[PDB]
Amino acid sequence: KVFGRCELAAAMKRHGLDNYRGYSLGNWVCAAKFESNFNTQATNRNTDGSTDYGILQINSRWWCNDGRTPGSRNLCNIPCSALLSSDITASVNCAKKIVSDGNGMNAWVAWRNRCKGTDVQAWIRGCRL
Ligand SMILES: [Cl-]
Ligand SMILES: [Cl-]
Ligand SMILES: [Cl-]
Numbered sequence: 001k002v003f004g005r006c007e008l009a010a011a012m013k014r015h016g017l018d019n020y021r022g023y024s025l026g027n028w029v030c031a032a033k034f035e036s037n038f039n040t041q042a043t044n045r046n047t048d049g050s051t052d053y054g055i056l057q058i059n060s061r062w063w064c065n066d067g068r069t070p071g072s073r074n075l076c077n078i079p080c081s082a083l084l085s086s087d088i089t090a091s092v093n094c095a096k097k098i099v100s101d102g103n104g105m106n107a108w109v110a111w112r113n114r115c116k117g118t119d120v121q122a123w124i125r126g127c128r129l
């Protein structure tokens with residue numbers, strides 16, 4: 001599913017991401033924009049052989065099982081395919097674990113490089129939330 005901007009903001013808020021670990025909703029929408037262009041089915045292979053899945057491009061190296069990432073973990077206890085669903089519950093619940101792991105949203109390199117420090121509230125501007 002390819003979400004609209006305000007549609008995704010609303011879904012993320014319904015699933016408890018607004019101000020989660022102190023990160024306002026616009027941070028999460030901005031991260032999703034540059035990780036996946038709001039497409040739940042996005043996948044990308046990393047140079048190390050791991051793969052990133054879903055709206056927030058969560059990595060099979062640590063967070064989900066795809067059966068093809070040697071030496072990896074599955075800390076969210078989900079198949080990576082669950083991160084591709086039109087229902088964002090699995091991605092949100094796993095993102096909550098990731099952002100709590102010590103480095104906040106810096107875990108998402110695209111957030112650090114493209115969202116951090118910017119006017120992220122623009123990403124939810126005008127949305128009925
Ligand atoms: Cl957009
Ligand atoms: Cl915001
Ligand atoms: Cl594996």
Ligand SMILES: [Cl-]
Pocket residue numbers: 021022103104105
């Ligand atoms: Cl933080």
Ligand code: NA
Pocket residue numbers: 035052057109110
């Ligand atoms: Na990525």
Ligand code: NA
Pocket residue numbers: 060061062063064065066069072073074
């Ligand atoms: Na894994």
